Amino acid sequence: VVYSEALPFLVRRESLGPVGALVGDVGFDPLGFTEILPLAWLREAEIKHCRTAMLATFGFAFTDFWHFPGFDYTTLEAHDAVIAQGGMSQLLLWIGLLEVFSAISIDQMLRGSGREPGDYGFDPLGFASDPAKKADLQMKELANGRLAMFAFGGFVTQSVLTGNTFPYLFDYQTAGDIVAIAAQGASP
């Protein structure tokens, strides 16, 4: 009897596949989406979300500090401002070309071409060319991206909630004492 290594009180499901066909298989699937959707589709979505979240959190943090001379907008209003300007239309156009090609690849992979879940073959610099390092780098990619999703969510939500630029921390957290030991009052 195989128990999920992330939830040892649940039996592995079945649709998750052999234990370890996918880097990161810690058997984390309490809600059993693998029964409804195919694992290859789900993993392609996973890596797409990972990569997009990575780029998004880095771009948010970067735009909090630096912007190009033309774009004089803050990170929150940049979306509206550059839709009005027209740049986001260009991003949508080019990412849509790339995404049409990507969707063709997902169709082929699901119909049985042989392509892996998120293997676009993008490897110019030669990272992970050695097969020994490839699985470890896939696992590192997944770990970093799954962290980056929460990173970007916290970035945006705390940014709007606080109104502060980089740290996304309230004024009392930034200025006052977050490691105090003398008895506090009613407000921070």
Partner: protein, 47 residues
Amino acid sequence: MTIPGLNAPGLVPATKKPAGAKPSFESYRDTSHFWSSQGIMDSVPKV
């Protein structure tokens, strides 16, 4: 125009406010694209 790097700076420092109180929930919900009437009316394509 301003070619970034040739006839202008490259990356330009952003304008920032030095900390501040929490904006009220109704301050940004009433301007959000999905939970504001005017925000919804402005969250449409253009051509």
